[PDB]
C-alpha cells in the first residue's frame, strides 16, 4: 500500500547515503555514527491534530464532523500542504503525504515544511452554503491551535477542493484572527486571481512535466544508453488519462513537435498513428461527455500500456502498473505524471530491462513553485513585472537604435539600413507581456537546475537509471545539512 | 472492560435519564426541541487531540524520539484542566476517556473549568535527573508553541507518575521562554512547591474531600433510615483497602471524629484489630521499614478484607476491584469509592438490589481538583490568602468581646466579670491563623453546597440509592446549560 | 567605606555562616553539594544595568543631554521595586549596592519583589517645574522601550528627591504611549497621589513600621531579661535624632503607647527636656516658621545627643553616624536604624561587646516596601479595600450582639441589653476606612517577620547581633526560591 | 587609545561643517546656531547595557560571564552591530567601535544605526559544547530586554567569531521569542550558506578595497595633482598582513593587472621584483604555517613600510604607521585596510608631501554592504535573481534574433551575429546571486566614492579624504534630525 512505499523508500535512501556521510561531511573521537540519530530523529511526523467541530445544517440539524491535519518537517518555517474533502480519509493517509510533501519541497529547493490535511465528508451531499459553514469552522478551529497563520502553516488545493473554497479561507483568517497582521491574505495558495491570485496557475504542473521530460531528452549521455539519441522529432509518446495534467502535457509537449500516437481514459482508449491534434480532442471533450467516439480516430482494444511508442505518460489513479504488466509494456521512457504509479517490484522489472523511469517525485513539482510564486507575490503586495515592463522596453528600443546608428555610420555613402525591426515572435512577446511569463520562466529554471543537481547526484552515488533513489539521495542530503549546522 | 466504553455508557444513560426533562418546561414551537436537543451529542465527542514526537539527548549523547499526547474535551469554559502521566502503556483511548471525565468532574464541584489529560510514552525509572528534565523542558515548549499550556487556555497538574518536581520545571519554562511578557506566566500550571507559588495544604487535600464526602451523607437522616442505622460518627467501623496517599489522609480524619478502624489493607497481607489500630503510630511504623507486615498489636486477617465486617469500606487501592463474583459477599451498608473507579458496572445493579448506597467516584475525590482552582487563584492574586484580614478579625474580635463585659458590667455593677477570655481551641485557631485554615473552609463549603445538589436531583428523578447516575445527570444538565444560553 | 564594599561584606559574611550547614542539613549527591555552591556566586552581582543619554529642550530654546541609570540585580521573582533620584551625586556602583540592598529588604519582608533602583544627573533646585516634566516623560519613554517599566517587569517608587507629581507623569506617560492596550497600565509605578489610584496612609508607613519593629522586641522576654530592662513600654525613655517624616512619624506614635520624649536633634542646636515634648506643638513649631530651633518649651541642649541618657535611640538623620570614635561613649541600651546604615561595621563591634542590642536597618524601615506593595495590588485588584465588606461586618457584628442579648434575657426574665459597644469600638465602626486594613496588614507583617528573625539567631547560636540573622535569612530564601526552581 | 582619535575626528569634523550649515543650509532672528545642540546629540552613545548571566560548566562548576552592548544612534531603527569573543572587551572600546559603525553606514548610505557588542571570555580554554551554552544564554538575555529584534538590532560576526555562532543565535531567537514573527531568521547576519547566507559574503571586504583603489586610480585630476599618470596596468603594490582581506585584495588587483612587490606579515616578509603568483601563495601558506620560505621569491630582511612601491595596503593590526616611520615610506597612496592602521599625527606629514591617503572609514564598508544585502534578502525569503534569469536569457536571444534577421533582409548571405562572444556565454550559462550581489557592491562604492570626492571640493579640502568623509557622514547623519521634530 502507498503508506509502507513511502518509508520504504526514505530506509532504502537514507542507507546508501549514510556510509558517505559519516567520512566526509563531519569536522570527533569516531563518535560520529552515533550522530546518524538525525535519520531518526526526521523518520517521523512532529505533529498530528484531531479535530470534531459542530455545524448547524439548512433544516436546523446538528451533526458533528472530524478533521485531520499533519506537520511534518519544521526546518523550514511555513509548512505546507493541501486539503481534501473526502469520506476515507485516515490518519496514516495524512501522515504519509506529508512525508512526501517534504521531500517534494525539498527537490525542487524551495523553503517549506511539509503538511497535510483532511476532512471526512463527501462533497457531493451538502448544499454550497453549508459546504461554505464547513470551511469557515474549520479554519477558525485550525487557525486557533496554531495551523494556519502565514509564517506558520500554508493550504493548498486539492483534487477534491476547489478555488471556491479557499477563497472562503482567505477572508476567515483575515477578519477574525490575522486582522492585525499585514500578510494575512497570504496564509492561502490557489486563490483566485481577484482575491491575489497568480497567473498561470492553471497550467502548471503540465509545464512542470513537459520541462522535466524536456531535460532529460536532451541528455546525449543518458540517451546514448537507451539507445535513442537525439533529441525531440519522430518522437511517439502515448497519455493514459485526461485530466488537467495529461490535457496541458500533451498540449505542451505537441507545440513542440512530438506526436501524440494514442489517448487512454476510464473509457475505451483511442488509437491513431496519424497523429493527435490536442485542440481539437479538447473541445471534442469539453462539447459533451467523454472522448468516446472521436472523428478520425480508431478505438484501441485492449490495454495501451503495452502498445509501441516512446514515451508513456500515466497521469490517472495510483497502482497503474503490476509485476505481471510491467514484462509487456514497449515504451523506453515511462515520465510518471500521477502519484505512485508504479510498484516497487516492477522497478526491477525496469531496471533489469533497461528502461528510464522518471520519478513521480520530481515530474509534477510544478505546482508546488508555483504556490511558492504565489506565497511570494502575497508577501511583496505586487504583482510581478508591474515596475519592469516598460523600461526593459525601452533600453531594447534604445540599443536598437544604437546599434543602427553605429552601423550607419560606418558604411554612410550609400545605405538606409534599418536593423531595428525587432521580429514577429519579438513584438508579440513585447506587446503581450504580462507575469504568466515571469511566472513559467521561473519554473522553466528551477526545473532544470533542479535536473541537473539531480544527474550529478545519480553520477556520483554510481547508480544507473534509478532516478528514484536519486532523487531521495538528494532531498535526504539536503534536510540533514540543514539540521546539521543548526543544532 | 476499558474505561471508554463505561463513560461512554455512564453519558449515554444519563442523557437518555435527562432527555425527558430537559424539554418540558425546560425550553421556550412545532416540538422542534427534540432537534434543539442535538447539543447532547456534541458534548460526547472531543474537541481537540494532539500527537507529539520530539528528540532528546541522552547522557551518553545519544539521540531518542519521545512520544506524547494531549487531548482536551469541552471548551465551554476556556482554562481546561489535567494531568500529565509518565508511563509506558498511555494511550489514545485512556487519555481522551480521562479527559472526558475530568469535564463532568469539574462540573459537578462548580469549579470553572474544561477537561484535559496528557501522557508520554516514557518509563520514569529509567532515566537520570538530568535527562527527565530535558524531556519536560522539551514537551512543555512543544506543547506550548501550538496553544496548550497558557494560563488562559490549559493548565496541567501532577498524575500519580509526576511530582512537584516536574512542574517547578513546567512554571519556570513558560515563564523564561514563552509567557516572558505574560503577567500570570507562573500560574500556567498547579501542584508547584510552596516556594514557587503553591498553596499550603495541598498533601492533604484529598483525604479532607473524602471525609467531608462521607460526613455529608452521614448526617442525613432520610438515608439512613432508608438503610437502617443510626445517624453521626458514635459507633461506626470503616475498613480501608489500601495506604496510599488517600487511604493515609482519610484515615485519620475519621478517626478525630470518633470513627474507628477495624481492618486496613495493601498490596499485601492485611492486619486487623477488633479493638482498633491507632493512625500516628502505623504510619511511623511503615516509615520505619517497608510496608505494614508485621506490624505489633495487629493479628494478620486470612482472606480477603472485602467481605469482612465493616459499615464504611473504602475501595481505595486500584480500579475493578468489586466485581459480580465477590459482589454478593460483602458484609457492608455504605461504600465509600475513594479510587478511580473500582466497581463494576454489573454489581452496581446487585449493590443495588442488596440495598446498600454508594457515593460516586465522580464526586468523593474532588478535593483535589478544587484545591487545584484555589491554588489558580492565588496565582492570579499574587498574594496569598487572608494576610491582609488576619489582625483585622484578631482586632474586631478583641473588641467585639471587650464590649460584652463592658456591659455586662455597666449593667450589674459592683464585680469584676470577665467573658474576654476565649477558649483554648479560639486561642490556638487565632494564633495559629493561616492559609491552610482557609483552604480546608473552602473545601469544606464546596462539598457541602454539592452535596445538597447531588441530594436535589436524586429526588427530582425518583432515584434511589444510585448516585452516580445522579451526579451524572448533574453534571450533563449544568454542562447543557451553558451550550444552550449561548448559541 | 562606601556602600558597596559593606554590602558586600555583609553578604560575604552571611554566606559563609550559612553555607557550612546549607551543604547536607536541608540538601535532598556524592558531596557534590558543596560544589553546587555557585548559586551563592549567582546571587551577589547585579544581573543588569542601563546606562541613558536623552535629549531635552529647554525652555529657552537650549538643548541638553540628560545622563541616567537603571539596575536590576536579582529577577528571582519577575518584578522589581526600587527609587528614583534627582541628584548630581549619582553613579552605577552606588545604583548597583542599593538595589542588591533592597533585594534582600524585600526578601527578609516576604514579599514577591526583585531588587532595582534609578537615579538621573541633574539638580532639581536648577530647572523650571515645566521642565521636569518634560525630563521625566523622556526618561519614562527611553526606559519603557528597553523593557524597564512594564508592570509585570519593573515597578519604580519615589525617593528622597522626588514626589507624587513624578509618579503621575510616568503613570500617564506609560498609560498613553506604551501600555495602551495593558489592563494594569496603571498599576506600573507606586506612590502615586489618591486621586490617580494611590492608596491611604502612604505617608505614615514607615512611622508605624519602625513603632511595630520597635514594639515586637521589647515585648521580647528573652531578650529584655539578658539585655538588663522590664519588658513592655512604660517609664522607658527614648531619643531620636533628626527629625524629618520618619522621626516625626515615629515619635507621634511611641509617644501616643506612653514612652517619653526627652531630646530631638537635627541639623542645628538640639532640644532637651526631662519632662517630655509633645509631638504636636513640635510639629506644629516646625511648620509655623523655619526649624524648631528656639522651642519656647525646654533648653537647648549642648553637646551631641548621642551621648545623652536614655533607653531607645533614632538614627534617622543620615549615614555613618556612629563611629569607632563615639561608639563607646553611648548610653542607650537599644539603638533603632531608621536610616540606611547609620552605623560603621566597625563600631559594630563594641556594641556586641558590651551586649547593646542594635535593630538592623535592613528589617526596620521595610514598612515603605511593603505599602508600596499593598499600593500594587491594590492597582491589580482595581478596587479599593474592603470596599464590598464593611457594612456586611458591621450588620453580622450587630446580629452577634442581638443574639447574645436575647440569649441573655431568655435565661432571666427586664431589659438587660448587652448592645451598646464600646466607645472605642463605636468611633471605629463609624470611622472604616482602607486605612485601618493596610495598617492592620502592616502590623501583622512586622509581626511575622520579627519572630522569622528571631528563630535564626538562636538556630546558629548567634547573640544580639541581628544584622548578621536578617542576612542569612535573606539569603537562606533567596537561595531556596533558586533551588526548587531547577 | 582608539577612542580619543575617534571623538577628535566628530570635533574637527563638526567644526568644519557648523558654519556652512547654519549660513547656506536654509532660506530667523540668528538663534539658527543655537540649533548647534543636535551635534552635541549625536556625538554621545544613547545606550549601553551590561549583563552577567551564569552557566554550568562540563565538570558541573557554575560560572559567570560579563557581556556588553551599546547602541550608538537610534535615527534609523535597525542598528547593525558585531559580537567579541575576547578578554579585553570594555564599556570605551564598544561605545567608540559603535560610533564608528554609525558613520561608517551612514557614508555608504546604508540605512543602519551603530552598535557592538563583546563578551569577556577567552574562546580558546572552552569546549564546543560549553560556547554554544554561552552563546546561546546571551541570546536569551540580550533578546528579554530589546536588543536583538529584527527591526531593533542585528548582530554580525567578528575577527574573534565565526559563522558557527550566528547560526546558534538564529536558531534560539527563532524557537523562544521570536516564534511568532514571520521575519524570525533575519535578526543575525552571517549565518552559514544553508540557513540564510548569500553567497559571494566572504570575498566582500577584499572586493570593496580592489572597487575603492580603482575609484579613486582612475580621477584623472587626483593623479595630476599627486604628479604620476593615471592607469592601472604600470602601477605596483606591497601589502602587508595576510588575512583575508589581504588575499582577496591582491588577487583582484593581480585579476585587474597588477604587480605585487612584496608580501609582509608576523614572520619575516618575502619579496620578489618579478611578481607574486596569489595562487602559488595561497597555496603555499595553506599547505604549512605561515609564507615563510616561500620559493621563487627573496626573503626580504627589514620593514617593507618603506619599499621603492606605488601603493601601501596596511592591513593589518591597528598603529602599524606612526611618527617614527611616517618620513622614510615611498608609496604614493596609502590604503588603509584594517581600522585605524596610521597615527593622526602621521596624516599631517603625509598631507605636507602630498601623499593621498585612503580612509578606513569608507574603504572597509564591502562588509558591511554585504550584510546589508543578506538582510535584504532574508526579509524577501528569496534567492536574488531567481525569477529574472531565465527570462534575461530569452529577452537577449531575441535582441540577436532579430539583429541577425535584418541584417539578413538588408544583405542579401547567412550572417550570424547570433552567437555571443565567449565570456557572455559563460556569464549567462554560470549566472547566480554572487553576480548580483558583485554588482550591487560595486555600484555602491562608486555611488559612494563619487559623493566623497564632490564634497572634497566645496569644502575646499585638499588631499586629506579623511575629513572630507567625516564631514559627509556628519551632513548626511544631521538631516535626518533636522527633518524630523
Given at each position: ?22 567520512e ?21 511526523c ?20 472530524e ?7 519544521q ?7 493541501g ?17 512526501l510533501?517534504?521531500?517534494k ?17 463527501n ?48 477572508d476567515?483568517?483575515?477578519?477574525t ?48 544508453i ?50 493527435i ?26 490495454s ?34 500521477a ?50 515592463f516598460?523600461?526593459e ?28 525591426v ?10 503581450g ?55
Amino acid at each position: 500500500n502507498f503508506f509502507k512505499m513511502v518509508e520504504g523508500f526514505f530506509d532504502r535512501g537514507a542507507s546508501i547515503v549514510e556510509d558517505k556521510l559519516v567520512e566526509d561531511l563531519r569536522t570527533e573521537e569516531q563518535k560520529r555514527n552515533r550522530v546518524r540519530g538525525i535519520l531518526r530523529i526526521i523518520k517521523p511526523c512532529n505533529h498530528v491534530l484531531s479535530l470534531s467541530f459542530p455545524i448547524r445544517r439548512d433544516d436546523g440539524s446538528w451533526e458533528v464532523i472530524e478533521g485531520y491535519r499533519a506537520q511534518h518537517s519544521q526546518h523550514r518555517t511555513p509548512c505546507k500542504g493541501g486539503i481534501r474533502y473526502s469520506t476515507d480519509v485516515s490518519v496514516d493517509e495524512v501522515k504519509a503525504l506529508a512525508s512526501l510533501m517534504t521531500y517534494k519541497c525539498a527537490v525542487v529547493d524551495v523553503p517549506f515544511g511539509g503538511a497535510k490535511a483532511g476532512v471526512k465528508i463527501n462533497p457531493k451531499n451538502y448544499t454550497d452554503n453549508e459546504l461554505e459553514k464547513i470551511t469557515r469552522r474549520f479554519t477558525m478551529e485550525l487557525a486557533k491551535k496554531g495551523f494556519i497563520g502565514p509564517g506558520i502553516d500554508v493550504p493548498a488545493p486539492d483534487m477534491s477542493t476547489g478555488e471556491r473554497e479557499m477563497s472562503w479561507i482567505a477572508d476567515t483568517y483575515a477578519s477574525t484572527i490575522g486582522h492585525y497582521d499585514i500578510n494575512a491574505h497570504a496564509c492561502v495558495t490557489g486563490k483566485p486571481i481577484s482575491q491575489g491570485g497568480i497567473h498561470g496557475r492553471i497550467s502548471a504542473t503540465g509545464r512542470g512535466v513537459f520541462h522535466g521530460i524536456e531535460n532529460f531528452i536532451n541528455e546525449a549521455s543518458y540517451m546514448s544508453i537507451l539507445g535513442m539519441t537525439p533529441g525531440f522529432g519522430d518522437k511517439t509518446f502515448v497519455v493514459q488519462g485526461f485530466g488537467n495534467v495529461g490535457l496541458h502535457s500533451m498540449r505542451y509537449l505537441h507545440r513542440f513537435g512530438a506526436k501524440c500516437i494514442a489517448v487512454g481514459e476510464s473509457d475505451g482508449s483511442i488509437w491513431n498513428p496519424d497523429g493527435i491534434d490536442p485542440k481539437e480532442l479538447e473541445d471534442f471533450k469539453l462539447q459533451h461527455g467523454s472522448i468516446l467516439g472521436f472523428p478520425k480516430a480508431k478505438p484501441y482494444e485492449g490495454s495501451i500500456l503495452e502498445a509501441d511508442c516512446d514515451i508513456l505518460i500515466p497521469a490517472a489513479s495510483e497502482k497503474q502498473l503490476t509485476k505481471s504488466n510491467a514484462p509487456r509494456v514497449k515504451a523506453k521512457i515511462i515520465a510518471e505524471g500521477a502519484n505512485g504509479p508504479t510498484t516497487p517490484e516492477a522497478d526491477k522489472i525496469f531496471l533489469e530491462r533497461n528502461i528510464m523511469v522518471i520519478p513521480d517525485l520530481y515530474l509534477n513539482a510544478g505546482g508546488v513553485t508555483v504556490s511558492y510564486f504565489e506565497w511570494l507575490k502575497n508577501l511583496n503586495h505586487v504583482s510581478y513585472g508591474r515596475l519592469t515592463f516598460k523600461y526593459e522596453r525601452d533600453s531594447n528600443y534604445h540599443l536598437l537604435m544604437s546599434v543602427q546608428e553605429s552601423l550607419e555610420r560606418k558604411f554612410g555613402k550609400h545605405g538606409g539600413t534599418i536593423p531595428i525591426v525587432p521580429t514577429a515572435e519579438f513584438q508579440d512577446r513585447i506587446s503581450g507581456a504580462s507575469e504568466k511569463d515571469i511566472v513559467h520562466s521561473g519554473l522553466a529554471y528551477t526545473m532544470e537546475r533542479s535536473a541537473r543537481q539531480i544527474m550529478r547526484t545519480a553520477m556520483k552515488y554510481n547508480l544507473g537509471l534509478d532516478l528514484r533513489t536519486a532523487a531521495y539521495v538528494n532531498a535526504i542530503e539536503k534536510v540533514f545539512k540543514v539540521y546539521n549546522e543548526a543544532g
